[PDB]
Structure 1
Amino acid sequence: MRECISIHVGQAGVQIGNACWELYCLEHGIQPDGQMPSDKTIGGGDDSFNTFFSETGAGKHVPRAVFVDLEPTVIDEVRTGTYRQLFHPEQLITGKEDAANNYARGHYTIGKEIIDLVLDRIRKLADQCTGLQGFLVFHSFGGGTGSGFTSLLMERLSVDYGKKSKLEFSIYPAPQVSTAVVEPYNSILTTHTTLEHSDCAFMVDNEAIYDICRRNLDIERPTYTNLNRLISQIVSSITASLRFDGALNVDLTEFQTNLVPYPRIHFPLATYAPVISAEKAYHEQLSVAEITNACFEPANQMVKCDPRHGKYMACCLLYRGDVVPKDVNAAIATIKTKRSIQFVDWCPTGFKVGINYQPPTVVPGGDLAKVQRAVCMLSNTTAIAEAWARLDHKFDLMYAKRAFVHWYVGEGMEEGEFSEAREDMAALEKDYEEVGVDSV
């Protein structure tokens, strides 16, 4: 038990789920039809991979997951594609008309027509569980479904499942990849209405994933497939602790004890290494010391900010592959002297370490080189408030003129909901400022 149900909402979520679940199957030796040759307990089992996969009596390993989108085009590619056999048809849910980059349509208008059906389908997965731990929610900040329907869902799950944990993987918008003019509005609106209901949320700046693919994989104009295949490795590093046996494996809830000092301060900075092309990795083995040092190079962050001009409240290192305690300890000692790591005066300055032995895999015909070891750092830095700042400014520029606000008011929202949300964001920026201040 300790089961974990994944919900993928809107295109971004759905497409990142395809990446994530493809990757999980390659990590656990699961085939596209769902069969696991290495699994000897037919029909059920109490294994670590069973946290993400249930088993049928026939031996099909089925993701504990739901895919929702308010229009069929993106989910229809799952329904006809390589892993169509992996999912039961009722895990894949669609409407006919999308939310049209409108939080109002995703949360209310189109959203209220399908919410009950979704919760009914989540509930059928929950009843397969003997000891449900919580939910992982994959969505974009920018989209109408990704913002609006997610918020609606998060509120409703808080009702049906009380305080049972809910983690987010949020895709923070950036103009390099597709963006719309109103994504700042949707971003602030969903971040406000979800903040009470999310226990921990890993933001992913598309610009950050864009720059990394360009710089490190030498990809000229990265596609969503490029970005999602990188993202899913970061998602896999965080969830690896839940899916694998391990002597030196720290569970993801134990890291969360350290990562969340107050409930609103639940936004960790993910940083991953190595991201390297097959061309460059040839005759080039990257040690524990090298990949650990890369975690403090801010060009490897999932979110663009500067931790060096902020303050740490937590530092966690999630190694996978050929790693042992000794080297990690040497590597951290090196870093402590040579690098710009200031903690707040109220937190202890240790680094919390976990290690999985199962080494990191890659998607066949991918861009990432196969490496022997890897690491995902999860830090709680005040610097991440910079992401809220950049987004809050864009919100303010349009809201000053009420630009596009009629599309939201047309679908039933009030102007009060914008200012209410924005003031919550103003408070959140002030909270991240207050925690950094020294005590008296």
Structure 2
Amino acid sequence: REIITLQLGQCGNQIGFEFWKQLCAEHGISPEGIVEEFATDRKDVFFYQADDEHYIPRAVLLDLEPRVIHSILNSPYAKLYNPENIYLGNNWASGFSQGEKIHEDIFDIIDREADGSDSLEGFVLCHSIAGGTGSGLGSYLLERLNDRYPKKLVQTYSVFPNQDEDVVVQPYNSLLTLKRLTQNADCVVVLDNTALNRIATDRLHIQNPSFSQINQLVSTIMSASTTTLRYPGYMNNDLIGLIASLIPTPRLHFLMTGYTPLTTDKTTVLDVMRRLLQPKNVMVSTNHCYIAILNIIQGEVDPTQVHKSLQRIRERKLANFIPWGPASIQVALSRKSPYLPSAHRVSGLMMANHTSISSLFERTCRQYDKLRKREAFLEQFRKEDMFKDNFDEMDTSREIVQQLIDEYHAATRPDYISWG
């Protein structure tokens, strides 16, 4: 059903605008919203059911001090959506306080779009971890949505920040935002800028327009994640049916992503299964076994050979898995999307709950603990000081992520029949 998309921060507004351009080019949509002469499919997931099928995206843009929003403005895709839901520092404290002072009218924008919608099923946050203006503001405002609407689902698209540390409060910003992602969000998809830049230098020799290329990558990711909804498929036409298979524990909602064609410039399903089982098709960088793996595929397949593919991949025993419990690898299939150029016809995408991300969390834990012991990298924000005199919110987040690391490592153990 009806899901309202949230874009915020410089990075989040970038991939949100790119993804809306992707869905405008993808379906039979003009740059004005007009249904084209080649448009059928399910068109009410983010698309406003207008009379002449002006499929207006449910896209709420809220930031302050607009820079990239001007670049969004001089475009014909500012005529695709505008139900007047577009709204005009880089620290957690500054963004937090700026979100505090104007929370009411932007939440009125939220409420107007909410009652204007037929239903509400999820909040999709276009974001990046410590995204400058996105950080602080997004954690605050995410707390406002989670308090104000406890009956909805939260998926947060963000990337792991790698800017080669310059802001020195970035582990604090990511730590507090990660606390809010634990307690005010039900799904967080994070990706490594390092591994994506490695794949970009792998397939081609371009790494310099990294923003533009990464918009293509995560726009392919998000269109592939919603393709079973936006084109008539069979299952995971709800977000919640997709989320339920991944999560055995509502604090372990952090998923690894991989994509089977690394070049775009076909063959059977067993082959792409073996490809995706390799960790070099993964977009993300002791012993770690997955909790549950699920794959979406789109392309030209043999409908009987997918049975044979699962049969051979099983009897190969090409993976490990976790001691505690019967899960599986899970196959999901949908159509190859029409009305775009179709190169490398099989494109697969994987969502897996892996314990390897606890090491990445521990890296940020060690960075935060190091800068905390040194205590010269908070820069004494007055907004942070009046917000928290003792800075024990960071201590509480470090406690939360440590409890999650403990849950990760006891889930690696067969004693997750007992407590983790």
Structure 2 length as normaliser, TM-score?
0.90
Is 1:424 aligned to residue 400 of structure 2?
Answer: yes
Q: How far is the alpha carbon of 1:180 from its aligned partner?
A: 3.6
Q: Report the secondary structure of 2:84's partner residue.
A: helix
Work out the CA distance in 1 between the residues paired with 2:343 and 2:28.
16
Is 1:102 aligned to residue 91 of structure 2?
Answer: yes
Distance 1:317 1:325, change over 3 A: farther
For residue 14 of structure 1, what is the aligned residue in structure 2?
Answer: 13
Q: Which residue identity lines up with residue 63 of structure 1 in the other structure?
A: P
For residue 122 of structure 1, what is the aligned residue in structure 2?
Answer: 110
- Aligned mate of 1:437, from 409, 413, 418: 413
The percent of aligned pairs where both chains have the same amino acid is 33
CA RMSD of aligned residues (A): 2.5
Is 1:381 aligned to residue 369 of structure 2?
Answer: no
For residue 282 of structure 2, what is the aligned residue in structure 1?
Answer: 301
After superposition, what is the alpha-carbon deviation per residue over 1:17-58, rounded to whole angstroms, capped at 9, x for unaligned?
0121111122212121111125989xxxxx622111103335
Question: 2:268·2:301 contact (CA, 8 Å) conserved in 1?
Answer: no
For residue 294 of structure 2, what is the aligned residue in structure 1?
Answer: 316
For residue 71 of structure 2, what is the aligned residue in structure 1?
Answer: 77
Q: Which residue identity lines up with residue 387 of structure 1 in the other structure?
A: L
After superposition, residues 200-239 of structure 1 pair within 5 angstroms as 200-239=187-226
Structure 1's unaligned 5+ residue stretches are 42-46, 95-99, 279-284
Q: Which moved more, 1:332-341 or 1:187-196?
A: 332-341
Distance 1:294 1:133, change over 3 A: same
Q: Report the secondary structure of 1:13's partner residue.
A: helix
Distance 1:157 1:240, change over 3 A: same
Work out the CA distance in 1 between the residues paired with 2:355 and 2:173.
23
Q: Report the secondary structure of 1:51's partner residue.
A: coil
Structure 1 length as normaliser, TM-score?
0.86
Distance 1:373 1:422, change over 3 A: same
After superposition, residues 326-337 of structure 1 pair within 5 angstroms as 326-337=304-315
Question: 1:360·1:373 contact (CA, 8 Å) conserved in 2?
Answer: no
Q: Which residue identity lines up with residue 237 of structure 1 in the other structure?
A: A
Question: 1:321·1:360 contact (CA, 8 Å) conserved in 2?
Answer: no
Q: Report the secondary structure of 1:49's partner residue.
A: coil
Work out the CA distance in 2 between the residues paired with 1:27 and 1:374.
16
Q: Which residue identity lines up with residue 95 of structure 2 in the other structure?
A: G
Q: Which moved more, 1:21-30 or 1:351-360?
A: 351-360
For residue 254 of structure 2, what is the aligned residue in structure 1?
Answer: 267
Question: Runs ≥4 in structure 1, deviation > 6 angstroms?
Answer: none
Q: How far is the alpha carbon of 1:144 from its aligned partner?
A: 3.4
Work out the CA distance in 1 between the residues paired with 2:110 and 2:299.
34
Question: 1:166·1:199 contact (CA, 8 Å) conserved in 2?
Answer: yes
Question: 2:10·2:132 contact (CA, 8 Å) conserved in 1?
Answer: no
Q: How far is the alpha carbon of 1:373 from its aligned partner?
A: 1.9
Question: 2:129·2:160 contact (CA, 8 Å) conserved in 1?
Answer: yes
Aligned residues: 413
Structure 2's unaligned 5+ residue stretches are none
Q: How far is the alpha carbon of 1:328 from its aligned partner?
A: 2.8
